[PDB]
C-alpha cells in the first residue's frame, strides 16, 4: 500500500519512489546513486537478484534515509545547470571550449576523417526525417531498399542511425542522438555495417518507411528512428562531494543537466584520470617505500624499453634534480615513472586495492583491467598506473573515494549514500557496511597533504579558498581531452572533471579550467562553514633544515636547502 521513500540527511522527502520502466527538487544523480547502491546492498545482504532487490525497493515500502544535503545538492545544481555562464563559455566564436576536427561541409570528423556528429542540417530535413543522399541509395526492380552510406549502420538487424550536433542560445555544442529500428528476422543481405539490402516484404508492414523526394533522396521517416530533440550539452561535467570523515556522500553531480534523467557520469562512466593518478598510484606508495618529502628525483631524458623519448613532460624540457614534493607539485611526468619503476606495478595494484580503485573482490565490477581480463590491452602499465593514461580510466567517484582516504588520516572509507533503510513496520532492514581499510600512515597522509597544498598556487589558482585550507591535484589528459581536480579542504572531499563526452573532441582551454570550477564548487559546498586549517602534523613527524641536492641535512653554504617533513626515523643523521 504504502510507497517507497529517499529522505535527506535531515529526514526531508526527496523521491517519491515509482516504477518508470511528487515534485522532485533535485536532478536524479544523487537518488539515482542511492536507489543503485541500496540495490548492491540488498543484494549482497539477502541473496536478491537484480530484479528482486529493485522489485523490493518499488514494492517494499522502505524508507531509504540517504546521506545527501539537499542545499549543497541543490546549489551545486545551480551552478551547473549555469555551467556556461560561471565558466565564461566563449559565445560568438565556434561551438565553446570546442576543440575538433571539420570537413567542408561543417561534419565534426575524428583524427582519421571519419564523421561523427553530422551537422543537423547535413542529416535530418525539416520534418526531423534522415535525408540519405543520391548515390548512396538504389532502390531494384523489385521495389527493395539498398543503402550504402556512412549514415546509417546494421548490426544484429538493428538499424543504427548516425549522430548529430547542434549549437544552442549559449553556443554551446549540444550532441544529439537518432534511435534505432528493429528490422524484422528475414528480409535482408547485409554486405558490411554500412551497405546492406532492405526487401520490399519488409516495407509491407510499415508502407510509411522510406520516400524519394524532389531531389533524388532517401527520405526515412523519423516514426521508426526517434530524434533525441533535446540532446546533451557539451562540454560536460561531473562532481562529487565528500566527507572523508565519515565517507557520507554531501552531493553528486552526474552533468550539467539536472531535468529528466541524465547519464550520472560520476559513476558510470569512466574517463581518464591523467595525473590525478600521480598521488595515490605512486607517491603515496612511494611514501611507505623508502622515499621521503625531500627524496630527489632526476627530471632526465627518459627512454621506454623500445628505446623512444617517453614520456614527455608538459614543459617541453627538463627540471633536472627535483626533490619529490616538487615532484608532484610540478607534476613531472619523468620523475612519476621513474618513481613507479623503481617500487613495483604490482606495489602499486596494492595501493590501488585498498584505495578502491580495483575492486578486491568481484575485479569485474571495477574499471581496471588486469592480466587476467586482458593481455593485449591491460592497465598493468606505467603509462596506467603512473601518468594515467589507462585502458579504461576511473569514474568521479572512485578517484573522489580515493583522494578521500589522504584527506581522513590515511584511512579509506567506502563512499556510502544512505545510512539505514527502514521498512513499513518501522524496523532498519538495511545498514551499509562501509568498508574501512587503512591506505597509508597518518604521518603520510599528513605529508601528502601539505605537498598537494602547493599545487593550486602553481597550477590551480581558480581552486583557492579566502577562508579554508585548499589542498588538490590537477590532471589534463593528453591533448586536453580531460580536465581534472580532485581535493579536499579540512571538511569535504571534491572532485571534478571536465570534458566532452565524445573524446574526439577536446577542450580549447588548457589552463586547469576543472580547477576553476572546482572552486566554485568548494565555495559553494562551504558556505557557511568557519575558517579552519588542515590538522597540524603528528607527534612522529619531526622538521628538519634539508638540501634538495641530496635529502641529507643541509649546513651553512648549501645552495637549496627548506625545512621538510619527515616520518620519524626517516630524517637524514649525516650532512651534506
Ligand atoms: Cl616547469
Ligand atoms: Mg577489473
Redesign the pocket.
Do not use: G, Q
Given at each position: 500500500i504504502q510507497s517507497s521513500t529517499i529522505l535527506d540527511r535531515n529526514e526531508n522527502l526527496v523521491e517519491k519512489i515509482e516504477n518508470l520502466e511528487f515534485e522532485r527538487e533535485v536532478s536524479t544523480y544523487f537518488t539515482e546513486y542511492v536507489k543503485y547502491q541500496v540495490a548492491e546492498k540488498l543484494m549482497k545482504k539477502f541473496n536478491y537478484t537484480k530484479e528482486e532487490a529493485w522489485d523490493k525497493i518499488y514494492n517494499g515500502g522502505l524508507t531509504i534515509h540517504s546521506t545527501m544535503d539537499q542545499n549543497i545538492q541543490k546549489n551545486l545544481e545551480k551552478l551547473y545547470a549555469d555551467f556556461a555562464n560561471a565558466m565564461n563559455a566563449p559565445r560568438y566564436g565556434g561551438p565553446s571550449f570546442a576543440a575538433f576536427k571539420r570537413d567542408r561541409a561543417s561534419n565534426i570528423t575524428d583524427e582519421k576523417g571519419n564523421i561523427i556528429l553530422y551537422k543537423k542540417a547535413n542529416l535530418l530535413d525539416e520534418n526531423n526525417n534522415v535525408i540519405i543522399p543520391k548515390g548512396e541509395f538504389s532502390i531494384d526492380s523489385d521495389n527493395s531498399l539498398k543503402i550504402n552510406s556512412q549514415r546509417v549502420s546494421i548490426y544484429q538487424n538493428v538499424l543504427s542511425m548516425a549522430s548529430f550536433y547542434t549549437v544552442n542560445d549559449q553556443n554551446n555544442l549540444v550532441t544529439h542522438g537518432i534511435g534505432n529500428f528493429q528490422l524484422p528476422e528475414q528480409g535482408v543481405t547485409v554486405e558490411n555495417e554500412k551497405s546492406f539490402k532492405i526487401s520490399a516484404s519488409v516495407f509491407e508492414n510499415y508502407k510509411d518507411f522510406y520516400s524519394v523526394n524532389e531531389n533524388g533522396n532517401l527520405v526515412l521517416n523519423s516514426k521508426y528512428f526517434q530524434v533525441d530533440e533535446k540532446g546533451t550539452v557539451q562540454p560536460q561535467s561531473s562532481s562529487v562531494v565528500l566527507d572523508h570523515k565519515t565517507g557520507q556522500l554531501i552531493a553528486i553531480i552526474g552533468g550539467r543537466e539536472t531535468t529528466g534523467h541524465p547519464l550520472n557520469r560520476a559513476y558510470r562512466v569512466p574517463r581518464q584520470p591523467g595525473s590525478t593518478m600521480k598521488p595515490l598510484g605512486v607517491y603515496i606508495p612511494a611514501l611507505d617505500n623508502g622515499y621521503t618529502a625531500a627524496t630527489a628525483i632526476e627530471d632526465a631524458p627518459h627512454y621506454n624499453d623500445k628505446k623512444e623519448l617517453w614520456p614527455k613532460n608538459w614543459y617541453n624540457g627538463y627540471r633536472g634534480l627535483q626533490t619529490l614534493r616538487e615532484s608532484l607539485v610540478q607534476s613531472i611526468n619523468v620523475n612519476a615513472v621513474k618513481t613507479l619503476e623503481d617500487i613495483g606495478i604490482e606495489k602499486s595494484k596494492e595501493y590501488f586495492k585498498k584505495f578502491g580503485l580495483?575492486?578486491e573482490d568481484n575485479?569485474?565490477d571495477?574499471?581496471?583491467?588486469?592480466r587476467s581480463?586482458s593481455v593485449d590491452h591491460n592497465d598493468e602499465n606505467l603509462s596506467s598506473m603512473a601518468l594515467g593514461g589507462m585502458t579504461r580510466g576511473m569514474t568521479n567517484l572512485k578517484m573522489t573515494g580515493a583522494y578521500a582516504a589522504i584527506a581522513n588520516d590515511g584511512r579509506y572509507n567506502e563512499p556510502i549514500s544512505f545510512t539505514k533503510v527502514v521498512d513499513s513496520t518501522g524496523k532498519t532492514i538495511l545498514e551499509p557496511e562501509q568498508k574501512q581499510r587503512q591506505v597509508t600512515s597518518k604521518e603520510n597522509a599528513f605529508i601528502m597533504r601539505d605537498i598537494l597544498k602547493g599545487v593550486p598556487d602553481v597550477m590551480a589558482h581558480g581552486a583557492k579558498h579566502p577562508t579554508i585550507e585548499v589542498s588538490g591535484k590537477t590532471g589534463t589528459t593528453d591533448d586536453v581531452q580531460d580536465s581534472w581536480f580532485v581535493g579536499f579542504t579540512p571538511y569535504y572531499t571534491i572532485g571534478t572533471w571536465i570534458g566532452f563526452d565524445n573524446q574526439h573532441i577536446k577542450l580549447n582551454n588548457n589552463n586547469s579550467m576543472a580547477a576553476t570550477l572546482w572552486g566554485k564548487v568548494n565555495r559553494i559546498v562551504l558556505e557557511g562553514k568557519e575558517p579552519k586549517k588542515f590538522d597540524g602534523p603528528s607527534e612522529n613527524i619531526i622538521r628538519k633544515y634539508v638540501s634538495i641536492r641530496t635529502g641529507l641535512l643541509a649546513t651553512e653554504g648549501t645552495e637549496k636547502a627548506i625545512y621538510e617533513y619527515f616520518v620519524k626515523g626517516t630524517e637524514p643523521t649525516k650532512y651534506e
Open positions: 580495483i575492486n575485479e569485474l571495477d574499471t581496471y583491467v588486469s581480463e
